[PDB]
């Protein structure tokens, strides 16, 4: 998951 | 009359037998907690007062002191957790939800303030409070056919306690919660004040931030058009919850993030990625780094935009931060792209910026950054250029740093420059 | 905007 929910 | 009471007279008074004189104690109370400066909210939990106030709240007979002792416990609710926590144990919360049906809208919004300050405290007396049921007295307050009718102060504290009620995600707000309130949450998000609409956004941006269903919940009520437009908006205090409302929408399944980008939102970037508030551009480039990491057809959409030479002139030059989130843009891109949008990336300028970032004292940067490089020596071996792309980097000075990041107390970066020297540099 | 209090 490329996509990172740095939150 | 009311003016600097000393705690003794106040308790002195409390205990009285006089309803007036306990009115006059309580608003003297009310006073020392709402002067603007250091309130001795530790005094007067300390004399045993909130069981007092909290009684006072029933008594319908009196608004007044039912009033008073609101807006006294809603500052001591205020306070660090303890205090708050003082004020919920007291027995508070299930009498400040009865005063949301109050005929007197001023005492009303009062319920309606200490309930917000209470559910702000975290995931737990926010839960506790919608066990106690608070959301449904709260929604009927709204349950107008026109919310411009509502006294302004009167809807922005219902919109933030309701923003309020949406935060914190461990554990995030119970589900049907959160369906309940949605549908009102959208109303909101239409209203045309500054402050609701910041605040509907931050609800919203709460709301979005977790597991992709929870996103799911949100983009299915159609309020992602109405968050691109709020992205434009003039003032600080919306973009900013807005931008993060879109930020977490994309964080999710292609199929959500493809929502923003019809609703427009890649417009508004070539703003975004030059604003001059820091953290808005750091948002923006993390925005992007999720886009990047999307589809072909959507990184396409990113190129149409001519937002990669935006992104070539973060990485160029930005916050640090900003700058590692531009890292990350570059390094999904050249991670799931065509060969010839990773060409295009650096016929765009690339290359130079992104070796002077291997000058970093952040190891996770300089990984996400090889990483890259890696990604498009890869693209142009396809292509056979893989010497020209090798010189380019050695032109501005990046071979003689890949070279030496081999000497680096990392693991990745060793390796990764080692085997890149080794493969590319020899 | 966690807490308000009015002042």
Request: aromatic content about 6%.
């Amino acid at each position: 998951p490329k996509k990172k929910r740095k939150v | 009359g009311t003016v600097n009471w000393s705690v003794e007279d106040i308790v002195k008074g409390i205990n009285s037998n006089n309803l007036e004189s306990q009115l006059q104690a309580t608003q003297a109370a009310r006073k020392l907690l709402s002067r603007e400066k250091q309130p001795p909210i530790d005094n007067i939990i300390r004399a045993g007062l909130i069981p007092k106030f909290v009684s006072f709240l029933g008594k319908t007979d009196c608004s007044p002191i039912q009033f008073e002792s609101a807006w006294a416990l809603t500052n001591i609710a205020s306070g660090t957790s303890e205090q708050t926590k003082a004020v919920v144990d007291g027995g508070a919360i299930p009498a400040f939800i009865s005063l949301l049906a109050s005929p007197h809208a001023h005492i009303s919004e009062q319920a309606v303030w200490a309930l917000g300050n209470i559910a702000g405290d975290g995931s737990a007396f926010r839960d506790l409070v919608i066990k106690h049921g608070a959301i449904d007295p709260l929604l009927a307050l709204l349950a107008v056919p026109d919310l411009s009718t509502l006294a302004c102060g009167y809807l922005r504290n219902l919109t933030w306690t309701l923003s309020n009620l949406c935060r914190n995600k461990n554990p995030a707000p119970p589900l049907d919660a959160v369906e309940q309130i949605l549908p009102t949450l959208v109303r909101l998000l239409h209203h045309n004040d500054p402050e609701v609409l910041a605040d509907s956004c931050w609800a919203i941006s709460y709301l979005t931030d977790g597991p992709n269903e929870r996103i799911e919940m949100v983009v299915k009520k159609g309020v992602v058009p109405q968050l691109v437009k709020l992205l434009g908006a003039t003032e600080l205090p919306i973009v900013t919850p807005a931008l993060r409302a879109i930020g977490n929408i994309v964080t999710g399944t292609d199929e959500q993030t493809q929502k923003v980008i019809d609703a427009g939102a890649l417009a508004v970037f070539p703003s975004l990625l030059t604003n001059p508030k820091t953290n808005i551009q750091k948002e923006a480039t993390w925005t992007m780094s999720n886009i990047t990491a999307g589809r072909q057809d959507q990184i396409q959409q990113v190129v149409n935009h001519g937002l990669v030479p935006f992104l070539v002139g973060v990485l160029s030059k930005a916050d640090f931060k900003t700058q590692k989130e531009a890292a990350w843009a570059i390094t999904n891109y050249t991670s799931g792209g065509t060969v010839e949008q990773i060409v295009y990336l650096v016929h765009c300028g690339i290359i130079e910026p992104l070796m002077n970032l291997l000058s970093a004292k952040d190891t996770k940067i300089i990984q996400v950054i090889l990483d890259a490089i890696s990604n498009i020596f890869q693209a142009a071996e396809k292509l056979g250029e893989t010497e020209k792309l090798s010189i380019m980097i050695e032109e501005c000075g990046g071979l003689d740093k890949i070279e030496a990041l081999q000497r680096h107390e990392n693991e990745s970066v060793y390796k990764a420059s080692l085997n890149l020297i080794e493969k590319y540099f020899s």
